[PDB]
């Protein structure tokens with residue numbers, strides 16, 4: 001009959017100060033003018049509350065709000081059907097959950113804030129869903145009822161009985177070091193205690209993960225990649241049926257992430273149920289039998305789809321649209337420059353730019369070797385390889401931060417540098433920090449599109465850096481490097497802590513400015529997609545991690561990608577509809593043919 | 609009352625008239641002649657025919673000029689639209705010619721066929737035109753309304769709502785256009801004494817409303833002395849406030865928005881304001 005619609009109000013308390021404009025929401029609102037209930041003022045907490053029943057959907061309150069604290073949306077009653085859990089009034093609410101299946105791996109992919117982490121907790125038995133209502137400390141009985149008609153119903157009965165206790169590898173990567181310590185109780189101690197499997201289990205898992213060096217080090221001491229892998233080890237070592245992984249690719253390098261994926265899949269063989277959440281598509285494809293996609297606006301809502309297949313789910317993800325849901329989850333589709341697309345220019349050749357000679361940097365524990373290479377103007381070079389290879393070391397030497405043991409690089413160039421792991425260590429607020437760097441760049445329209453508008457830094461401006469978040473801080477750092485003028489810019493691993501949309505904003509940023517400005521940039525990365533878009537040449541690193549390493553001169557996109565991918569031995573085809581790289585299995589039918597041709601990738605992409 | 613005038617033509621004849629509620633009466637009619645020269649004719653396949661489209665162009669401006677010269681006194685059109693009628697092409701040859709007066713082509717509101725003309729075709733032109741009339745009405749109300757309103761409230765606050773707000777700003781002459789409705793639910797009442805009074809705004813549901821009516825100090829429950837409709841009071845004193853008036857009901861898109869929000873009500877400002885005051889504040 002009539003169209004079915006709803007209104008949902010979510011307000012962010014961080015953004016709201018009702019002293020500032022007085023309580024302007026209660027006034028202003030036409031519902032309240034009549035004497036209705038749409039917005040009620042909470043006198044104890046001093047927060048405005050908007051009731052969804054009485055609200056008109058007018059949106060008058062939204063544009064009145066001096067910050068942008070209130071958000072009213074109108075949905076066709078898509079969310080109402082699905083309600084799983086709600087944090088509180090006017091807060092994040094979760095919709096649907098991912099199915100678990102024995103003997104298989106089920107994937108999850110989505111943008112941050114969707115409730116991927118929350119979903120894991122509910123499945124874990126850590127949190128009890130309220131069901132968008134009263135549902136108390138684990139009143140699991142009601143949860144089963146809500147899930148009826150879904151395959152999770154059987155799972156919730158199992159969980160309540162405590163027949164199975166799921167093992168969880170914790171999500172937040174930044175949080176782990178502070179929580180766990182063990183200089184004495186290093187990594188080795190944890191692996192010994194947890195090993196329910198065999199004494200072989202300790203050895204086998206350590207070898208495949210490339211943990212051998214790290215056992216002696218303590219947990220707090222570990223680097224990001226090392227920290228992640230230890231968690232993985234415990235999740236194999238444990239005896240249980242259900243192994244939940246939440247973002248296992250985080251911090252890891254390209255070689256290691258693939259390794260993690262294979263080992264985790266081994267659980268499926270013992271017929272143990274596995275669940276996993278990933279931001280990386282290469283890794284996600286490899287692990288999963290089934291895939292769920294989580295979509296919706298960040299921090300407002302996030303719904304889980306029906307289970308799908310591995311290929312199908314990935315294909316649908318890339319279009320940016322889901323048909324049943326009928327939502328354009330992403331505003332713009334992702335595309336990579338063909339390399340036909342790029343501008344044709346004559347580049348500074350001859351002494352294009354500066355050149356570096358052979359370089360060596362030796363710690364006495366690790367040795368880096370570099371081959372003389374050349375850099376030209378207005379180009380960009382990708383740096384790839386596994387961590388511990390001295391990818392980080394090389395960039396620092398060029399920065400002038402590090403002194404080479406051998407070789408010399410004294411350029412008369414101004415360098416801007418962006419560090420790999422970002423930890424605050426700066427007193428002051430976010431805005432102040434940006435402003436010292438450059439005020440003018442904050443004015444430009446491009447910076448509005450990429451930084452300011454999406455995150456809402458305006459709210460962030462007063463907040464402290466210590467108080468801040470991981471991914472938010474990352475986009476800020478990348479932009480800041482770009483803040484100041486320099487002949488050459490250096491960035492180290494921009495993809496960390498970022499979801500799909502966030503990385504891709506970065507890809508466009510580096511390529512566009514470098515082209516306009518006619519300056520050079522070196523970017524290190526693990527994400528294959530990012531490298532393709534930005535670069536014109538690449539340097540590949542090889543050797544053995546935590547031991548020795550080597551670097552190469554810059555070489556063309558096609559040439560460099562063949563070398564890199566040859567090292568992994570996994571080829572990528574193309575999906576004809578989505579135009580994504582389709583992981584071709586080794587011994588894929590196609591794998592053999594592609595290797596013969598010497599083509600690891602298709603539809604090679606280059607800088608714009 | 610609301611006045612519409614129309615011109616129904618053929619070569620047999622032509623006819624002018626109006627309706628205003630039940631009222632209905634023609635004004636004038638005339639004829640010319642002409643068999644149809646595109647047959648018989650001859651070595652003059654244009655000689656005779658060019659007198660005849662000329663005599664149509666004489667006819668149709670003598671029609672439409674008389675409709676202007678007695679529908680309008682005091683610029684443009686005094687009526688607020690125009691209609692054309694006839695057999696197939698005999699009226700397309702009007703609305704796209706050099707010989708229908710400029711500024712009059714800008715005022716057509718429907719174009720109708722009728723199987724026959726005169727007084728039998730006039731009832732047919734009222735009856736099937738009903739649709740056109742409804743369309744025009746909608747375009748005027750809904751649209752224009754729904755449009756202007758939202759399209760450009762008048763950012764920062766160049767607005768008021770409610771009686772309290774919409775009236776002070778109407779008293780201040782800060783309201784370009786006042787937006788009411790017809791079935792207004794607010795009226796001006798007086799609850800007062802031996803040498804003084806209070807004016808409050810009341811609706812239907814009397815809860816706390818009846819409660820107050822007073823202030824506080826003197827302490828006096830209440831007595832209503834008189835009651836004057838706000839809609840009417842406004843409907844009749846709009847010139848005094850300089851605010852410009854539009855009455856409306858409930859029919860159209862964004863129509864439902866007014867009922868839920870701007871409930872027969874709304875003031876649009878000339879310049880930009882400071883919103884109502886009161887006193888209950890400290």
Ligand SMILES: Nc1ncnc2c1ncn2[C@@H]1O[C@H](COP(=O)(O)OP(=O)(O)OP(=O)(O)O)[C@@H](O)[C@H]1O
Pocket residue numbers: 087088091092093110111112113114115116117118119298299300301302
């Ligand atoms: N304590 C809380 N109170 C209110 N809302 C919360 C709380 N914890 C989480 N949320 C809400 O649940 C949503 C978040 O988390 P989850 O942890 O479920 O995200 P994800 O789906 O794992 O996303 P990400 O990729 O960003 O880690 C958020 O958008 C947030 O609004």
Ligand SMILES: Nc1ncnc2c1ncn2[C@@H]1O[C@H](COP(=O)(O)OP(=O)(O)O)[C@@H](O)[C@H]1O
Pocket residue numbers: 363364365366385386387388389390391392393394545546547
């Ligand atoms: N000061 C140091 N002393 C000893 N070993 C070091 C030192 N700095 C780095 N290393 C080691 O060098 C190896 C490679 O380092 P790095 O260049 O940071 O690698 P990546 O390719 O991951 O960026 C790692 O095994 C690391 O532990």
Ligand code: SF4
Pocket residue numbers: 015016017018019020021022023024025048064065066067068069070
């Ligand atoms: S949300 Fe905005 S308008 Fe409402 S109290 Fe806070 S600051 Fe004032």
Ligand code: SF4
Pocket residue numbers: 009028029030031038039050055056057058059060061062070071072
């Ligand atoms: S969106 Fe509209 S209806 Fe909801 S709280 Fe704001 S003003 Fe009131």
